[PDB]
Amino acid sequence: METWVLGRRDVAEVVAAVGRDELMRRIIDRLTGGLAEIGRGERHLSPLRGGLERSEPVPGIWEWMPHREPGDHITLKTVGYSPANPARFGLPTILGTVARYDDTTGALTALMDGVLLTALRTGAASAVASRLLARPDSHTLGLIGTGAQAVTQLHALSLVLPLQRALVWDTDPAHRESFARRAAFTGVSVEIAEPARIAAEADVISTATSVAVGQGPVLPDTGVREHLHINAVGADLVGKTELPLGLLERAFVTADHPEQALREGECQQLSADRLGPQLAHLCADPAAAAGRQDTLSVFDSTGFAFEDALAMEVFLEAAAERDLGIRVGIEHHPGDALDPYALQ
Amino acid sequence: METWVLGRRDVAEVVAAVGRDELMRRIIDRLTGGLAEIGRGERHLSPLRGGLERSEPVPGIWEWMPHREPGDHITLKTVGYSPANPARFGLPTILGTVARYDDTTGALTALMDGVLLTALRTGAASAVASRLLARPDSHTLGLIGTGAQAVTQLHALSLVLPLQRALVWDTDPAHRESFARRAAFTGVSVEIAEPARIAAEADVISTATSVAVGQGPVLPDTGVREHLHINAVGADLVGKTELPLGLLERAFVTADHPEQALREGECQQLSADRLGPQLAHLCADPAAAAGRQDTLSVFDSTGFAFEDALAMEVFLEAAAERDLGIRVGIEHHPGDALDPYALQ
Ligand SMILES: NC(=O)c1ccc[n+]([C@@H]2O[C@H](COP(=O)([O-])OP(=O)(O)OC[C@H]3O[C@@H](n4cnc5c(N)ncnc54)[C@H](O)[C@@H]3O)[C@@H](O)[C@H]2O)c1
Ligand SMILES: NC(=O)c1ccc[n+]([C@@H]2O[C@H](COP(=O)([O-])OP(=O)(O)OC[C@H]3O[C@@H](n4cnc5c(N)ncnc54)[C@H](O)[C@@H]3O)[C@@H](O)[C@H]2O)c1
Ligand code: NA
Ligand code: NA
């Protein structure tokens, strides 16, 4: 037995061969079915993630996220949020890896990049929620925060809504000015616009910022369109929020993971008895979403490990088809199972 | 930037090149200093490990154990306890891996086997505690459970005490028969002995069994020598214990990790108010342990992630000196930090 390692090269070859659109659609479809299975009680939400706060060079966090499929495998994603990474080191803010362990023996069976996978399934989750809660003729997307997640927010949403334009804002002028080039492949025209204009004109918004704890909101409490749907995607430290309390109190709020969202999502700001049914329930029974497209809605997204397990399965299916990756004997399996020093 | 991976073959070469005694001594020395640093408030106990119980084929657990050295690195050990592994699959009961992440950026910098490392630092921790709490002229070691951990329990304790004899028991006759061959490199004469004889004769005992929840004790509450020191090393599921309650209530008890031990150690049997100073405090101030060498003592061992980080450092230092391991690009670092699709 050896660990199946998908290097950065193998992950790149999967998305190159399959195509960004098709790969994103596969992950959207997988997440949709998987969320519906949770909503039907056929599967369970992942346990709460844990994390270690880091103060330097700026406040960030490093988190671990398990999800068990009993009798089959356990998925663990380890992921850092380090928002000085881009400017200071030319590294992504979100850096992670995803591992799979055999549930029967405990053995490490597969290991892969989590950077691309994280951006894909986070876009896909917003797409699942926005298909339920945004107007199906939504034309104008607003983006607050135009870093890494903004790219897959725009991409995923462009596959499920007829988006024609994106109004975008970032507090870093370089990061907002570069977004059009990163977005170009989608065919959605990009225009820089201040947050008040985005609030007034957008049919759907995604907020995905590295705003510090206590420095929200990133979208002002002002007039929005009656049917606005917001994907609140930023999430890292306890205390970090993006939306104004007044807007949230007027909204139909569905969390991907209620207990996690109450700790780390916009639901930090809300009384627990004001949550709408969670996303998995909407996927299994759309009665709870019926009519909510035409009034203010918020998808409170924190991400949870089941989404990583599902996206990992999409990657492993493609990689297995193509015989991609390498085998590394990482774990020591002594010839005598009772002898740690039998270094066979 | 690529991840440094030490495979099974590199770990085996470290042992072959450094030597078992020298490698174990390095890990004992690192653990003693690190624990003293915790006892002096220069470093801090790792957070509580987390875990997922599994019921098939027999009850076991899969656990994650993070530890952070601020500004340097984060260590995470992922480890399964699957006690049917030896008989059913020829695999060790304890199967795990240790990963190292840069604390500044979050990047995965190193990954190695945790099977051998786990056995080494678990023996080392018992040796640290027993040097403090066992009579320095202890001649007879008792072992209940003669699986993988027993091998390094005997090895490490033979390096810090003048052991002449090991009295050993396992409920599996083949496992107790084979222990002497697995122990031969230590030079300590092994005898098979039933638990009541071990309790009556031993100067120091380690219990390290796969006993099931609620099926203890593995050592009877009968005559023990006045000065007996016990390393309670078995630890997996909540509810699993190895010592008789009456013995525990008479003993001076020190945990490696009080909060973990209250959940998963012998201290499950004890009121929270009943524990002594933890092992770290005894390392920093051994005056609190010297006076307990001649009375009944228990080191309640659960294992915690700091031990894995320290032992991993020993292996990385030795592997670097010998240019061992491979470099694998696992994480995706896009050429544009804000573009997840910018596959370099
Ligand atoms: N919900 C999920 O599942 C999920 C998954 C991954 C990441 N995230 C979170 O999404 C957030 C963004 O991640 P990323 O990978 O895009 O990081 P990033 O660093 O690539 O982009 C964040 C951007 O937000 C901008 N920003 C900071 N403060 C702002 C403000 N007040 N207004 C507007 N823009 C602002 C920054 O200048 C930067 O360009 C983080 O909180 C991250 O932890 C969530
Ligand atoms: N404290 C720590 O840091 C730490 C580290 C690693 C493992 N552990 C724990 O130590 C225990 C042993 O692990 P291992 O790797 O040696 O497993 P192993 O399966 O190699 O050995 C366990 C042995 O215990 C024997 N056994 C079971 N029930 C018994 C009983 N009632 N009396 C006597 N013997 C019995 C089994 O026959 C087996 O030979 C496990 O609970 C493991 O989770 C603790
Ligand atoms: Na959120
Ligand atoms: Na214990």
Cα gap B277→B290, rounded to integer Å: 13
Q: Name the one residue in this structure whose structure tokens are 């370089």.
A: A174
Task: Tell whether B153 is in a known binding site.
Answer: no
* ∠ Cα B62 B63 B66 (to 5°): 160
CATH for B118-300 (3.40.190.10, 1.10.275.10, 3.40.50.300, 3.40.50.720): 3.40.50.720
- A59 CA distance to ligand 1 centroid (A)? 13
DSSP code of A211?
A: P
Pick B113's closest partner by Cβ from A62, A118, A332.
A332
Nearest CA to ligand 2 atom 10: B234
Give Rg (Cα) of chain B: 20
Cβ–Cβ under 8 Å, residues A229 and A204:
yes
- Contact predicate A208/A234, CB 8 Å: yes
Whether B216 contacts B240, CB under 8 Å = yes
Q: How many CA atoms lie within 13 A of B64 on its CB side?
A: 25
- Max Cα distance, chain A (Å): 70
CA A195 – CA A209 distance, rounded (Å): 13
Contact B333 A80 (CB under 8 A): no
Residues at CB less than 6 angstroms from ligand 2: A 338; B 81, 83, 86, 93-94, 118, 122, 144-149, 169-172, 175, 208-211, 218, 233-236, 301-303
Per the entry, the structure determination technique was X-ray
Q: Which residue, B137, B62, B72, is CA-closest to B103?
A: B72
Cα–Cα dist A233/A94, whole Å: 13
B90 vs B170: CA distance, rounded Å: 18
Phi–psi pair at B169, nearest 5 degrees: -145, 145
Pick the atom of ligand 2 nearest to B122's CA. 3
Q: Which two tokens stand for residue B243?
A: 């010592």
* Distance of alpha carbon A119 from alpha carbon A104, whole angstroms: 30
Contact B91 A337 (CB under 8 A): yes
Show which residues of A are catalytic: 77
CB contact under 8 A, A68 and B86: no
Secondary structure percentages of chain A, helix, strand, coil, to 5: 40, 20, 40
Question: How many residues can be counted in chain B?
Answer: 344
CA distance B244 to B224: 12
Q: What are phi and psi of A145, to 5 degrees?
A: 90, 115
Minimum CA–CA partner of B5 in chain A:
A330
User: Which residues in chain B have their C atom more than 2.5 Å from the N of the next written residue, marking a break after them?
Assistant: none
**Catalytic positions of B:** 77
Contact B93, B58 (CB under 8 A): no
d(CA A328, CA B5) in angstroms, rounded, equals 9
Atom of ligand 2 nearest to the CA of B235: 41
Q: Which numbered atom of ligand 2 lies nearest the CA of B83?
A: 19
The answer to whether B168 and B146 have CB atoms below 8 angstroms apart is yes
DSSP 8-class letter at A42: S
Helix (H, G, I), strand (E, B) or coil at A143: strand
State how far the Cα of A336 lies from the Cα of B85, in Å rounded to an integer: 12
Cβ density class B54-83: b for 16+ within 10 Å, e for less: beebebbbbbbbbbbbeeebbbbbbbbbbb
Question: What are residue B168's DSSP bridge partners?
Answer: B143, B192
Task: Tell me, letter by letter, the H, E, C secondary structure of chain B.
Answer: CCEEEECHHHHHHHHHHHCHHHHHHHHHHHHHHHHHHHHCCCCCCCCCCEEEEECCCCCEEEEEEEEEECCCEEEEEEEEECCCHHHHHCCCCEEEEEEEEECCCCCEEEEEECHHHHHHHHHHHHHHHHHHHCCCCCCEEEEECCCHHHHHHHHHHHHHCCCCEEEEECCCHHHHHHHHHHHHHHCCEEEECCHHHHHHHCCEEEECCCCCCCCCCCCCCCCCCCCCEEEECCCCCCCCCCCCHHHHHHCEEEECCHHHHHHHCHHHHCCHHHCCCCHHHHHHCCHHHHCCCCCCEEEECCCCHHHHHHHHHHHHHHHHHCCCCEEECCCCCCCCCCCCCCCC
C-alpha span between A172 and A194 (Å, rounded): 12
**Pairwise CA distance, residues B254 & A249, whole Å:** 51
| Cβ-based neighbours of B49, under 8 Å, separated by 6 or more | B63, B64, B65, B260, B304, B305
Closest-CA residue in chain B for A333? B91
Q: Is A326 on the interface with B (CB under 8 A)?
A: yes
Which protein residue has the closest C-alpha to ligand 2 atom 3?
Answer: B303
Between B54, B151, B341, which is nearest A339 by CB? B151
Angle (nearest 5°) at CA A249 between A245 and A252 = 125
Residue A204: CA count within 13 A, CB half-sphere: 30
Looking at the complex, does the CB of residue A173 fall below 8 Å from at least one CB of chain B? no
d(CA B309, ligand 4 centre) in Å: 20
Contact A128, A306 (CB under 8 A): no
Contacts with B, A 121-160, CB within 8 Å: 146-148, 151-152
Give which of B74, B302, B44, B114 is closest to A64, Cα–Cα.
B74
Contact criterion met (CB below 8 Å) for B286 and B104: no
How many CA within 13 A on the CB side of residue A331? 30
Q: Are A158 and A201 in contact (CB under 8 A)?
A: no
Instruction: Please report how many Cα atoms fall inside a 13 Å half-sphere around the Cα of residue B322, on the Cβ side.
Output: 19
User: CA-CA distance, A48 to B177, in Å (whole number)?
Assistant: 45
d(CA B227, CA B296): 5
Helix (H) or strand (E) holding A190: strand A189-192
d(CA A169, CA B265): 53
Nearest to B20 by CA among B209, B154, B191: B154
Integer angstrom CA distances of residue A52 from A78, A287, B46, B295: 11, 39, 11, 40
Nearest by CB to residue A64, choosing from B52, B66, B344, is B66
Task: Give contacts of A81 with chain B, Cβ < 8 Å.
Answer: 106
Burial of residue A70 (CB within 10 Å: 0-12, 13-18, 19+) is middle
Q: Tell me whether residues A95 and B76 touch, CB distance under 8 A.
A: no
Residue A79, classed as helix, strand or coil, is strand
For residue A49, what is the DSSP state?
A: P
Q: How far apart are CA B136 and CA B162, in angstroms?
A: 8
Rounded Cα–Cα distance for residues B89 and B93 (Å): 10
Task: Report the C-alpha gap between B137 and B130 in whole angstroms.
Answer: 11
Q: Are strands B297-300 and B60-69 parallel, antiparallel or unpaired?
A: unpaired
What CATH number labels A117-300?
Answer: 3.40.50.720
DSSP A229: E
